[PDB]
Write a protein that binds this ligand. Structure first.
Ligand SMILES: [Zn+2]
Ligand SMILES: [Zn+2]
Ligand SMILES: [Zn+2]
Ligand SMILES: [Zn+2]
Ligand SMILES: [Zn+2]
Ligand SMILES: [Zn+2]
Lengths: 517, 510, 518
């Protein structure tokens, strides 16, 4: 751990991380539907659909072990409510023991097979009923048909949206969290091995979200690397933080040039998880770690640049650290995973690197900088050369690289590039089981000639092709010569603009990829 | 039928070259095992070197001593095989006649990509534009399959041809080819000549400016082309697009001095019909952007004569299908042609219009007029009761930021049809990539007053949002959507590509 | 106290002219009923013609010279009208065979001259003073003005007459000579006499603030500006206190210190105090925005229209507060205690600068999510308002060149005032009337408050949903005044005289009249 430099004594010297969230205190109990439901204290919610009939009537098909509540939930009373996706209603009644209970439902539409987006819409309605109410238990009854991955996704998303980050509130606050969660589902014994898997995947996403949402005066190269050391110490992971003196010896000129104009020294994070049984799989995960992207002398001054959001330019690093928690907790075997990130800050200063400067990567390649705001591929280039030297089988990088993703895939799907069938297909398969959507995009070799520099070995940016995401992959491909490599561009999907919060995108996708090899 | 004019000097028809000098070239393919003979003309070797860029080495028992000593390995070490380099020299043969010999480097990747093979053709054509010879012979010292060989011939013919219809102030007559299994490539020769003109014909329509190529003159050429090919044809006028209530399509052309014209060509095969296909192309002869005028930097208003490339690709496909005459297929070539102008009669941003299927649309941007014309075209296409609907359009400039200028994007609601398009992209060597229709963005097309919004005001993924809009007008048929806004125009050479003609034709034939 | 330098040629102090040529002018006011003696220099008549749109000129004062009375006869003035701003020069010899200069300045046909009208009248008078080498100017008031307007005439005459040449070297005006005497003939002269030395005090307070604003940011920095304020307090004998970075750290002024993080000049907080002899019945804290240069930070002023070259004036509010400190310290009002406050710093681009998105903690514990580094004025004032409320005052008045949106609402003439208390606003408007510095009342719309709700911090610095930045900024400042009556004057549009290429010194007379009438 290094000392965080400060301009004034009021500058923060560490990122606040919440490890023991109220989600961790929720006792989760799952029961089988073929045994009846017991309407207890708190709120009991039914997940109901109606296949074929758009906005069809509500019909409860589960045995309720209460004569009074069964009379309330009869077909001749559900009738006036429909199953439109996202609709919710509250019921108040008295049970057989003359006790007042609260019951309700959330409509799951028709369609029968709900997408990840549709399930989020259902979960958001569920959270609205959990909000502004002081319940001690919530019970969810699954009268919709879901597989194991979608059931785990339901719990992960519910935990994540229910959780509220108040680390930076002072004068502001309000009300409490439920202490128990009940789940009724057919074949319940098969679904509940996913419960504690969902709790692990939740915190990894929330931990990544905590690091992303942390501003750049809190989350800087020094404090971000310190948090990775702190996380590795709790999970007993091997760790090494590379300082400038070691990065100078490794000749990481591309990575070092980006951080020249920062008051925080560059810090390269290298975490390692090793298995007990002999290792038959070696994987290196690389994340872009720019704690703040001012753009450099190519300053983000255009209206659409969204510079006030550029604290999220380390979303790739947070996704890898979130994976380090999930992998470090569940402990898969026969794998070595290397969690890497070249962390720095891209600022404007007398010491900053200039547009037009020619820099040398750690593999000997010289690069002519055409735009200082394209610093991601420069830091990733040195990180990929470092990653390949570790002798791994797969290299997967994740980065908020290009704003062009907002104009290609948008805010819902991330893009994956690569040089190999199966690493892309294994990543695409992991997107299916993790329910984090990713789309395969091409590396068009015709654009490679536009990176031909007149003086340096290669140009950092193209001079003609406006497809920045594809050109960046072509540039990064030049720094992986022999290893299977894939690249995930999450620049469009990392931040939830409507909810004004991070998504923690990549944690579950990367973890599922490690666990399925 | 009659093109309106403002002044008497305004043109009233698109000029088209039907008989190009390429059609006069007799092509002959021989097997390389018998050796090469350089009697007359210019002979060019296509050379590679797995392990380069290193020197070229000619492998041929060329039966002329003067050129054979010149082509010796000791004399070709001073030239390299870098992708694109070329050197050609002229000298005397055994009969004391002047001949020219040279090479084109093909790199070290053994299998040339579509872009790599193109670059080889450009180097070969460069020497052809500085040539006054009567015969050219090409020797393939590289490995090419049957589809890439045809692609080589098409690109050679198309890049060699020069469009001089609008200029006011030569070609070889024989083409020789030496390659293994000349019998297998022989059948590919005349397919390339047909694929060439369909591409060149579409380029002629695209390159034709908007004062020459307008809704009336473009539909007149489609009829004239249909008569020479003998396809069924009907052109729908305004007075009866109004009867079909094509309000989205008719609103776009309101501000134009040219009446809207709907092109409908039909091909029917001799064998039994096992596939009914409708090909729809965006046909905006000029896109001013409407009252959302293309005034921002990057709008490229001077190139907006190319906004009918999808229609031109559909018309070019009608040539290839009408000439090669495939069977067991019935194809409808459709395009709703109009002009998007600024006028007192133009439609306004915010106007609510009604498509031919009853859906009300709130116009959010008049430059997004392409999806409005395609909406009514898809309702018309689905009413035909066809099995596949494939539309191709220069829809959104965001494609320049997604796939760029090389790869086109395809969206659709049917996995099987998408695979046919991707498989046809492989054999046609016109690259296309599959992009998703993410239903998550559909909610942003919810209009406060109309049935559906024309554009999304929040999601900046215009290519995906526009595909979501078109999907709302296809109820039951397998449908795919090819966006060629990024690939249609070749900005470096300042000329069209004719992109999509061979892609659609290969899809029909396979 | 020591100004840091990059090179040895960087200035280490703001040059200030204390003894201006105006202070050497002997001013004497005479009664118009006794007649005017024209003798030497230039004699100017302020003439009107009610009802007649630019009607003929009529000199209506008894002149004690037969020759000059014959020249000023009605039959000789066919050709000059009273059009507002029109002026004419006359040459003649008086009864003593001495050459004299006489003229007039047209004051229109509206018996009551507005503040803008009187400024146009004074500007015409100064044009006759320039390019001429006179030793006395004499003004004859043939128009009706109250005691406030007569004083306003003198202040504007003094202010426009003076020429600031501190930064000329090879281009000083060689033909620049100031008059040494000023005679004024006015109806009921004894009632206006007391306004003369009040006008001279009001002149320098306005001119002192103009000197500080016109000084560029390489001369006027946080250190040299606070050093000048100390020098001013010592000349006036006021209590003074300059708070350094270490004291501001202990007061937890995180918003103020975050703005100046990227500067080579340390933050300097000005705290001057004037206390009364006798019992005090009003405690007032005057807060002025003191941004010596506003580059905008990482939200750099790069868009067209931002006028990054004029941002040396972003400390105009501080200058207006210090200019009032001179007026209060000189006229010495009592039954009042005044605090002159300013959180002075520089908003720069550096590796140490604060970033968009950073969350900072104010001195009252509230966390703020920064949305735009160019909105730094409201950040420094927030800590200054919390500091002011701890002083236990009755009124808190802040003055700041806060939002460029003021240009599109009120323009370049009227300043905008916001507040949480009605009587304070009414007192500000009353001071605006008597000081003749126009101010208009604008609302603090509480419906916009919801757009300042931050997802992580206690409050957002900016809205970025509501485009009414002048109102939104007042919502923000209101969050840091809990119980005291507070008003806020936005002078971003009125501080700089774009046409005249010089500051206005706006606020000095307005604040002093507010202090003098409570
Ligand atoms: Zn960047
Ligand atoms: Zn970046
Ligand atoms: Zn358009
Ligand atoms: Zn268009
Ligand atoms: Zn500012
Ligand atoms: Zn400012």
């Amino acid at each position: 751990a290094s000392e965080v430099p400060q301009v004034v004594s009021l500058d923060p010297t560490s990122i606040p991380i919440e490890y023991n969230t109220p989600i961790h205190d929720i006792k989760v109990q799952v029961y089988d539907i073929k045994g009846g439901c017991n309407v207890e204290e708190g709120l009991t919610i039914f997940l109901v659909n109606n296949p074929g009939k758009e906005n069809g009537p509500v019909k409860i098909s589960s045995k309720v072990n209460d004569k009074q509540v069964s009379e309330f939930l009869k077909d001749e009373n559900m009738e006036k409510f429909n199953v439109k996706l996202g609709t919710s209603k509250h019921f108040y009644m008295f049970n057989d023991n003359k006790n007042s209970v609260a019951v309700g439902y959330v409509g799951c539409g028709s369609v029968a097979d709900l997408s990840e987006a549709d399930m989020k819409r259902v979960v958001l309605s569920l959270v609205t009923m959990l909000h502004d109410n002081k319940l001690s238990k919530l019970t969810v009854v699954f009268e919709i048909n879901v597989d194991k991955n979608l059931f785990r996704f339901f719990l992960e998303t519910l935990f994540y949206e229910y959780m509220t980050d108040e680390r930076f509130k002072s004068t502001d606050k309000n009300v409490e969290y439920i202490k128990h969660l009940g789940v009724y589902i057919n074949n319940a014994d098969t679904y509940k091995e996913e419960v504690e898997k969902a709790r692990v995947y939740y915190f990894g996403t929330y931990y990544a979200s905590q690091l992303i949402a942390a501003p750049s005066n809190y989350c800087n190269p020094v404090s971000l690397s310190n948090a990775a050391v702190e996380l590795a110490q709790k999970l007993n992971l091997e760790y090494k933080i590379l300082g400038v003196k070691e990065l100078e010896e490794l000749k990481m000129g591309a990575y070092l040039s980006v951080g020249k104009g920062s008051m925080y020294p560059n810090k390269f994070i290298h975490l390692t998880y090793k298995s007990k049984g002999d290792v038959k799989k070696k994987i290196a995960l690389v994340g872009k770690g720019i704690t703040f992207d001012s753009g450099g002398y190519n300053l983000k001054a255009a209206p659409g640049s969204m510079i006030d959001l550029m604290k999220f330019d380390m979303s790739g690093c947070a996704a890898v650290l979130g994976c380090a928690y999930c992998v470090g907790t569940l402990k898969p075997e026969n794998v070595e995973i290397h969690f890497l990130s070249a962390v720095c800050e891209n600022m404007v200063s007398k010491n900053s690197y200039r547009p037009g400067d020619i820099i040398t990567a750690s593999n000997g390649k010289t690069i002519e900088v055409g735009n200082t705001d394209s610093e991601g591929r420069l830091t990733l280039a040195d990180a990929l050369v470092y990653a390949e030297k570790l002798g791994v089988d797969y290299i997967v990088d994740i980065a908020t690289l290009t704003g062009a993703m907002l104009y290609s895939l948008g805010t819902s799907y991330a893009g994956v590039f690569g040089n190999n069938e199966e690493l892309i297909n294994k990543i695409l398969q992991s997107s299916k089981t993790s329910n984090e959507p990713v789309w395969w995009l091409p590396i068009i070799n015709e654009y490679r000639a536009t990176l031909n520099s007149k003086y340096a070995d290669i140009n950092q940016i193209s001079s003609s092709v406006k497809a920045s995401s594809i050109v960046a992959s072509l540039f990064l491909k030049e720094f992986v010569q022999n290893t299977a490599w894939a690249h995930i561009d999450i620049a469009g999907v990392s931040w939830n603009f409507k909810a004004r919060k991070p998504k923690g995108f990549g944690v579950r996708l990367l973890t599922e990829f490690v666990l399925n090899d």
